[PDB]
């Protein structure tokens, strides 16, 4: 893979430090997603980033977005990956307003299996779970992306621009703890955002919850650290769902459910067993 090898089709989206293009890899004819991340970095570490990304060639799971290759040109590391024509659940949540508890069930399974896959077969945690990083497609697949595989790339990304919100767990915000337990919190927070259809920090006021200038990021972080976790509204959701997000959002990581415990959860047993035209729901909402 190299920069000449590609033809731009369209811009799939952009973030805080990265841009994603739907492209056609000329030699193979393949349509793929090309992610460019701007970095000013020493040749020795760019080459270390590439080399470390090559581990994705082995990462094969239906809960993990596929990897075609990686390279550096001009001023930018390129990651070429499985194009997901459904987009990110962030994009979806915009068009769908709120995601039905029953679909979120499939999503919750997909996330857990993928976090399990990463953990066990590749020794790594995600680091960055949130709606924009769960990708869905026509065939009803829900895959995870943008996880922390290259340790060097993690390091090189630390010199970054300021975000506008955050899904970081409180224990990470305090440097108190660092494990999969933190990715569980982020899944928890994501779910609440996807369920209610609005980023749950801070919580909605009494009036605002009836319908259903932005808080600066430092205030958001200070909230997460010092305030009780968000939670689902009382009636609109099953008690099993409310209980599920709750065990994901416990401030103290120790007391927070783990992947084994979550997997056999009432909400997961139910949803696994349910059969939902997920692929159908997806295309119908686009």
């Amino acid at each position: 893979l190299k920069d000449d090898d590609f033809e731009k089709i369209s811009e799939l989206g952009a973030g805080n430090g990265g841009v994603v293009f739907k492209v056609s890899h000329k030699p193979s004819g393949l349509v793929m997603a090309r992610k460019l991340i701007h970095l000013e970095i020493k040749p020795a570490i760019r080459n270390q980033i590439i080399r470390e990304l090559q581990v994705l060639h082995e990462c094969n799971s239906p809960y993990i977005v596929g990897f075609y290759g990686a390279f550096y040109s001009d001023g930018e590391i390129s990651i070429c990956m499985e194009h997901m024509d459904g987009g990110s659940l962030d994009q979806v949540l915009k068009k769908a307003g709120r995601i039905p508890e029953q679909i979120l069930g499939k999503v919750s399974i997909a996330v857990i299996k993928g976090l399990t896959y990463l953990r066990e077969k590749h020794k790594i945690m995600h680091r960055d779970v949130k709606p924009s990083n769960i990708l869905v497609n026509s065939r009803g697949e829900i895959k995870l992306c943008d996880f922390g595989v290259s340790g060097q790339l993690i390091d090189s990304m630390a010199n970054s621009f300021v975000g506008t919100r955050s899904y970081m767990s409180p224990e990470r915000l305090q440097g108190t703890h660092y494990s999969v337990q933190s990715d569980i919190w982020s899944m928890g927070l994501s779910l609440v955002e996807m369920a209610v259809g609005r980023y749950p920090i801070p919580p909605p006021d009494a009036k605002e919850l009836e319908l259903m200038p932005p808080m600066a990021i430092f205030e958001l972080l200070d909230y997460i650290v010092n305030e009780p976790p968000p939670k689902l509204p009382s009636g609109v959701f099953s008690l099993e769902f409310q209980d599920f997000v709750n065990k994901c959002l416990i401030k103290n990581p120790a007391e927070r459910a783990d992947l084994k415990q979550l997997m056999v959860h009432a909400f997961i047993k139910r949803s696994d067993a349910e059969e939902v035209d997920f692929a159908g729901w997806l295309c119908s909402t686009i």
Binding site: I41, D74, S160, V162, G175, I217, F218, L221
Partner: protein
């Protein structure tokens, strides 16, 4: 007037809004707003950035040359041969002598002194926006966040915090005031620049959690580890760095005082 009639500019390569190497009475730098329908917010951004540059004529401010509207919104400035301070310090690890490092400090201060003297707060000072032109002359650039201090406290209103975190002062991060920027916030950024100059590394190299740094710096827990200054760093510089980096903004020196500190230092070696 500094409007460049359409057609004259000849956009070429790309580097990193978005910046191209172009042609207009010689090599120039062209910074464009790629898109096609400029929102009135992107418009006022442009109007403001041009407004600030127009007031600058100093050898350490990167030379504004003119602007274009018709093809796309764009700002034209002098072209620079040679790299950013970021690039020297963290990429090609240029082995500057301490007298040179002090001089880079000195010039950077000189450009900042000149801006503050005309009431411009840069708001995005950092290694990348400091160019060693022909390896000999510091030119401060990128005035995309620059602003002029308004005499009246209610003109401010709401602006979403943006910028590189490693150079943001704790009060800016916290973002508790209507306007947390000040000449002093620029000084803090320059403080981090002293850090890169006297140490060779960015701050917080053991921490790679972006949100954690924002949270710990804003809270007072985290601050640069001054022990990492190289041993040839004059004691006066270490002190001056620690002063620019004070958490209580009012405790930070301003640029004339910073300039004096460096002159007085310079006066001390043979």
């Amino acid at each position: 007037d500094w409007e460049i009639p359409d057609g004259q500019i000849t956009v070429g390569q790309r580097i990193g809004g978005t910046v191209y190497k172009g042609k207009w009475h010689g090599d120039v730098a062209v910074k464009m707003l790629n898109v096609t329908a400029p929102t009135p917010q992107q418009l006022q951004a442009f109007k403001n950035e041009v407004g600030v540059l127009r007031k600058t004529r100093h050898v350490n401010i990167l030379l504004f040359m003119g602007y274009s509207t018709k093809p796309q919104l764009a700002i034209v400035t002098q072209w620079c041969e040679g790299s950013s301070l970021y690039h020297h310090l963290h990429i090609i690890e240029t082995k500057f002598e301490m007298i040179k490092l002090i001089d880079i400090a000195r010039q950077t201060a000189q450009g900042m002194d000149y801006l503050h003297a005309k009431s411009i707060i840069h708001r995005d000072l950092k290694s990348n926006n400091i160019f060693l032109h022909e390896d000999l002359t510091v030119k401060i650039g990128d005035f995309g966040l620059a602003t002029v201090k308004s005499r009246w406290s209610g003109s401010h209103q709401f602006e979403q915090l943006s910028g590189s975190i490693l150079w943001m002062a704790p009060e800016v991060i916290r973002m508790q005031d209507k306007n947390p920027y000040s000449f002093q916030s620029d000084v803090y950024a320059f403080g981090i620049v002293l850090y890169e100059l006297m140490t060779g590394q960015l701050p917080y190299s053991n921490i790679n959690n972006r949100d954690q740094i924002i949270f710990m710096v804003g809270r007072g827990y985290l601050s640069p580890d001054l022990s990492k200054v190289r041993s040839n760093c004059p004691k006066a510089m270490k002190r001056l760095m620690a002063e620019c980096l004070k958490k209580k903004r009012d405790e930070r020196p301003l640029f004339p005082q910073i300039l004096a500190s460096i002159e007085l230092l310079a006066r001390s070696l043979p």
